[PDB]
Design a protein around this ligand. Structure first.
Ligand SMILES: c1ccc(CN[n+]2cnn(Cc3ccccc3)c2)cc1
Ligand SMILES: c1ccc(CN[n+]2cnn(Cc3ccccc3)c2)cc1
Ligand SMILES: c1ccc(CN[n+]2cnn(Cc3ccccc3)c2)cc1
Lengths: 354, 354
């Protein structure tokens, strides 16, 4: 596909030749194949490969994925990526340098929103998240990510002024909900809602779940979670409730605001039980050996836990989205998205009687 | 042993309680045990433990090693440490944060210089280095580390002016060798000395080799290489030749200049053959099957390779040491050490007839 500018082709050639082994070490300028996967100012993706006629010398890859940043956290994320790679929970790490990195190229596609509700898919997503939740990572285990982040973003939101008329409007409506009071109502609800602290993805939407090419008939091993840039030790209820929220949001819409929201698409109780029934035995591990009574009590408690934490997904991503409306160049209806999440927050409160 | 200053105890307590699981999460400041392993302005080491009376809740460690920095590379080094950890080639990585890290505590001691020449030890060092040399790492494979670094350091050396009499004296004697011309003579010699590029430790001295406690009966599994701060893709000959040079230097001397040098302690040909005879079958892996004459040709040429690259160990650490004499406050005769390495450089040249 249509090439990057010559500037980056050169740098991409150098990075591949120097960081990759076998036939890559002796590739010349004229033999280098690169095409753009995703452009933009930040987090660009290119596919890079050897000529179809060059043979590999050993077990080096024929095709790799280059990721470039654009514009502390960067050390943590790299270490995280490298660990996942070592454990076979993520794409392999082939090179790491200031401007970005070289990763394994996984033939696949992203899931669509409508696929999240398919029983086989939903069950596997549950299995993988549980596995994720169960591993050790060399990061801070005090759960300050969630309210630390909402407070930070809220503070910034109170400070924003917009220059354009309609954004000033939309902002005025959102501020009229009294966000600082509403945040303390949330804290109180969640502080009396026990949830184990675990290693969370925190952004487990369909764009971050790959359907692996050639495994489409596997029932339980056709997927992989990617993109852990928001990962942290956090309440388990947030990770699961955030995922459920994402059943309602489709970002493949091609016209402004470049998403659709549908409250009726939140998972039914039946559907939520199917997800947590798959999660628990994969997360607790002698869960199956409990009495039907005990299991049912745990499930019922977990349903309260996750639907309450779901409120924090709306509230966090609502605030985040307001800030993005000021500072991002990406074409997306950030303010309308914010209003959508806040509508769902208040609908969900009403559902719960909270 | 030794107690650190109060701010450190406090910060150390917090890092342990927040990053470590099980009984660490619920420890009070008055139950925290910490003693100093090594002080100074940079790279301090503390042992941290639970009370002898507290029980563990699960598989968390009772004792850990904290390392603090003090004064790109930092990303690479962390990713490197985390990979080694995942592969069981280094201590486990328990937490990582801007000020330093938490590592597994390996009961052990460092080897002494005189132990490097013990047959069992020398053979095992060879086996481990070869294993090291054979692994894949997500770092630059173009071998620019060695002369890139010497050039950098040389340039700084030509710029240094000292105020203290005896350092000015030592500096003038070292500059009188014409170091820029001598560097180009080294480049020419090494450009015509073939050596495979491999993942090198670059600092494989006795301070960086642990004798593992309880395995002192084991003939081949009682050691571990540590401290890969200087690691990079580099010529194999450097790694081995740098190791052989370190047979000549004892850093346990307790009076100024705080090392001793003994040229007669460099390994004999017999001793070098013992080392490479252990290395080769561990690095090539179908080496034993070759005809006695092919093996003998490979060994003889490897002896040439490593003794020529040994010159680059002297020259690099010589220059590095001159620069440390300006900018480090560590009590060490950096200038005398520089002169010792350069004496050995010229004695070695003479040995070779180069
Ligand atoms: C492109 C398209 C939509 C958006 C916002 N929409 N949104 C919903 N969830 N999240 C978390 C999330 C955060 C950052 C990036 C993706 C998801 C963000 C940003 C950029
Ligand atoms: C919409 C949004 C995100 C995704 C995948 N998820 N994801 C997580 N982080 N990023 C970076 C990133 C996100 C948005 C734009 C550039 C870089 C992307 C799929 C569909
Ligand atoms: C203990 C051991 C060796 C030395 C000096 N000399 N010297 C030459 N190479 N190296 C490795 C090295 C490099 C940087 C810092 C320490 C070691 C050290 C001082 C104290």
């Amino acid at each position: 596909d249509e090439q990057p500018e010559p500037r980056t082709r050169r740098r991409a050639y150098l990075w591949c030749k120097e960081f990759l082994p076998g036939a890559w070490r002796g590739l010349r300028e004229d033999e280098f194949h690169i095409s753009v996967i995703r452009g933009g100012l930040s987090n660009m993706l290119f596919q890079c490969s050897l000529p179809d006629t060059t043979a590999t010398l050993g077990d080096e890859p024929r095709k790799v994925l280059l990721r470039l940043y654009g514009a502390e956290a960067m050390v943590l994320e790299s270490v995280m990526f490298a660990i996942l790679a070592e454990r076979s929970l993520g794409p392999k790490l082939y090179g790491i340098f200031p401007q970005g990195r070289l990763e394994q190229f996984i033939p696949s596609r992203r899931l669509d929103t409508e696929e999240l509700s398919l029983p086989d898919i939903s069950a596997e997503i549950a299995e993988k998240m549980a596995t994720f939740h169960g591993m050790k990572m060399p990061f801070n285990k005090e759960p300050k990510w969630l309210f630390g982040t909402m407070e930070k973003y809220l503070k910034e939101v109170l400070r924003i002024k917009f220059t354009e008329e309609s954004r000033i409007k939309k902002l005025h409506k959102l501020l009229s909900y009294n966000l600082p009071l509403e945040l303390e109502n949330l804290r109180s609800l969640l502080e009396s809602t026990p949830s184990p602290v675990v290693f969370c993805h925190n952004d487990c939407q369909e764009g971050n779940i790959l359907l692996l090419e050639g495994r489409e008939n596997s029932e339980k091993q056709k997927l992989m979670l990617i993109d852990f840039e928001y990962s942290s030790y956090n309440y388990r209820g947030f990770d699961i409730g955030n995922h459920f929220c994402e059943w309602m949001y489709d970002y493949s819409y091609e016209k402004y605001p470049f998403f659709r929201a549908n409250i009726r698409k939140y998972p039914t109780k039946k559907q939520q039980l199917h997800f947590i029934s798959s999660y628990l035995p994969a997360f607790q591990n002698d869960f199956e050996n409990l009495s039907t009574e005990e299991k049912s009590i745990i499930k019922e408690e977990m349903l309260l836990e996750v639907n309450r934490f779901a409120l924090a997904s709306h509230f966090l991503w609502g605030l985040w989205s307001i800030v993005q409306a000021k500072i991002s160049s990406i074409e997306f209806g950030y303010m309308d998205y914010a209003q959508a999440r806040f509508d769902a927050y208040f609908h969900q409160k009403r559902k719960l009687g909270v």
